[PDB]
Assembly symmetry: D2
């Protein structure tokens, strides 16, 4: 395995160490080499550092000058059909490796059966969620309406009336 | 008179291995502790080695009903943005909550185009994601090399913007008014 | 200055207006973030022995702890450093705390310390820490520090943080 | 053992895929058992990471087994890492690790011996990102630090005294007397 040397000796700095205190690890020119993940994990144990930290910032950014652009129907797109019933049409919006917590989706609602924000781009949307004391709460969101949802709140979005196809923008973040 | 949550103030004192008995000149009921002016509250802040803000952290009542906040179209704040004498945006707040003050969701009407001069913002510390709902949108942002970058987003396209990146959204076609959804978050 | 920065996040200015906090959908605490002046002397705060808060802890009529604040700063209200004198041993009954939301690390500066805590399955776990030994404790873990020998008063440093 | 293979927690990976409305089937070239998903080298894992628009570090987040025993970790004197510190041909510190846990890698607790004094030239550090608090357990400690606008400030800390240090503030601890060797406790965190 290959690890960014400048980053590794930055991690070693937090433990008041250098490349010296690593047992037989080949290195030269801003690169440190481990023979196997089990080897790196043993180094991870020794430094009392989780394995994930050794890759932090090692992935090349997918941004173009601090910006990433996605196109309609450009990324992942899927249909959700369970039991012959057409429910959703999933589509990824712009996703970046600079914020894995960010998940943006465009949803075409067809059927009548992390923090999150949801905006209704078209049609009437029927929203359910479990309030406190396990009370079944429901409401109808129309075009222009938006909703904020606290983490760990059971909720579902569907088409209000049926026949008419609705569309929402769902953003999950941190 | 200044009020501070009793349970929260006791929790603060608990960490410092203190109780309300270790605070002087303080009135209190079951829910709150009372101070004689902010000058009194400043002395106590000094005594506990604590910023004045900590007395009110988590003491704001939630605006969710419940765990959920719903906004209606044109239900919130709304204004026009004029930069350098140029009509640029038409801000409309989406749903806002005090459970996440770092979240700013907006619907914008673009009014400027290529026949108007460029008016970049200073950017913001908020991560931003923008979705185009209508029309064609010209986006310009300042790259790493201090140089200007540009692109065009059509209906359905989206863009992610790193914090503190100066940017501008205008109409690709002069005259035609486009619409976007701008979501700022932590 | 700070208010105009808070208003800027809502795309507002001073002439668009503590019910204000409710209207701006902003917690009351955020309007004070940064108002208190730093107590640091050029990025540093120094505290002397027996200078700050000092208290004796007597639980159930038995002398257990002697709390003494180390350096405290308004630049980190989550930091709580204490020097403790241990006065109780195992001939006096065991009295655990309720734990706390802060991560904690303790260092034995003198003597021998008997540490008890509630681990898995609500089981009472025990061990002994000598001078130079240390212990990390997860948040909300009920624990207790007493003398191992008894009479031989020990001393520890306990740091609480984020 | 196969050194080329990279193992990833199956439940964790599936959780990541679930957020992006995906299942394991949308990844073709992967073997897996009940507990883990296997990749043919780091080259393969980087392809899947880019496709998922997910940084390489996220595949291992929360997957490290805890070194705690019953929510507690105990260290002994001379039981862990121990190192000498010479900065400019000048013997300065003797680093000794206190208890270190992977449940808080930002927590670096040290017991230090002071070897330098007024006879030796000053050797400040460049400061660090971690907040720090120091407690004097023995001797008299001379502390120097770079204040605001690059002014040199000094003070003396005796047994029982403490000091808080803001992140990225250059500092140095030496023996006040000169000859007598002092001891301190340094706690770096978040
Ligand atoms: C200082 C700490 O470790 C013991 P307690 O004061 O929380 O009971
Ligand atoms: C005690 C501590 O300040 C030494 P260093 O952090 O400069 O290495
Ligand atoms: Fe903006
Ligand atoms: Fe404690
Ligand atoms: Fe330091």
């Amino acid at each position: 395995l290959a690890v960014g040397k400048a980053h590794l000796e930055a991690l070693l700095a937090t433990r008041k160490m250098t490349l010296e205190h690593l047992q037989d690890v080949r290195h030269d020119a801003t690169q440190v080499y481990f023979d196997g993940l089990e080897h790196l994990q043993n180094v991870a144990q020794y430094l009392a550092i989780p394995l994930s930290e050794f890759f932090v910032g090692q992935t090349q950014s997918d941004l173009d000058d601090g910006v990433k652009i996605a196109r309609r129907n450009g990324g992942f797109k899927r249909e959700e059909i369970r039991g012959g019933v057409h429910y959703y049409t999933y589509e990824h919006l712009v996703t970046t490796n600079q914020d894995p917590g960010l998940m943006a989706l465009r949803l075409d609602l067809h059927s009548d059966d992390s923090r999150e924000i949801v905006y209704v781009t078209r049609g009437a949307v029927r929203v359910r969620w479990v309030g406190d004391n396990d009370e079944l709460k429901e409401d109808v969101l129309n075009e222009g309406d938006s909703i904020f949802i606290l983490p760990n709140v059971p909720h579902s979005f569907t088409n209000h009336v049926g026949g008419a196809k609705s569309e929402i923008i769902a953003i999950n973040y941190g």
